[PDB]
Amino acid sequence: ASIPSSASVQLDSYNYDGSTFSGKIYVKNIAYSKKVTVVYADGSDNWNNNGNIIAASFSGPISGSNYEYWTFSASVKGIKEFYIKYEVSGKTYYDNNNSANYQVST
Numbered sequence: 001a002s003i004p005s006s007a008s009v010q011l012d013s014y015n016y017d018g019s020t021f022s023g024k025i026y027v028k029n030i031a032y033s034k035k036v037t038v039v040y041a042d043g044s045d046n047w048n049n050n051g052n053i054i055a056a057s058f059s060g061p062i063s064g065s066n067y068e069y070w071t072f073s074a075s076v077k078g079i080k081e082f083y084i085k086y087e088v089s090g091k092t093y094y095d096n097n098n099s100a101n102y103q104v105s106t
């Protein structure tokens with residue numbers, strides 16, 4: 001992805017190596033305190049009522065923009081698809097890939 005034009009949050013890239021699921025996210029710096037999570041469906045495409053969660057962490061600023069990078073990396077038993085949830089300044093935002101969710105192959 002590119003630095004977004006307006007979106008509060010936008011996944012950039014991700015990888016799954018068989019066990020470790022990781023990635024990088026564009027996050028608008030709306031306010032300082034943020035919660036950025038990756039909510040996923042497991043290997044059988046079970047979303048488990050939004051209970052499969054990885055917390056992302058601040059990575060670094062994006063100079064001259066209103067965005068910053070956040071990253072995540074965690075062990076998962078299995079994963080078919082996911083979206084990003086972002087809470088900041090009392091509001092919840094999502095990047096669910098324009099309703100498609102992000103897919104992990106196989």
Ligand SMILES: OC[C@H]1O[C@H](OC[C@H]2O[C@H](OC[C@H]3O[C@H](OC[C@H]4O[C@H](O)[C@H](O)[C@@H](O)[C@@H]4O)[C@H](O)[C@@H](O)[C@@H]3O)[C@H](O)[C@@H](O)[C@@H]2O)[C@H](O)[C@@H](O)[C@@H]1O
Nearest residue numbers: 039041045047050082083092093094095096097099100101
């Ligand atoms: O008992 C099983 C019955 O479920 C089947 O369908 C249920 C749907 O469950 C999954 O949905 C997960 C959903 O998660 C993301 O959506 C996020 C949205 O929800 C937030 O909380 C917020 O309100 C929204 O802003 C946010 O966008 C994904 O983006 C989304 O794609 C996911 O669907 C399945 O993934 C769905 O496919 C299912 O429709 C089934 O229909 C029943 O027949 C079963 O009995």
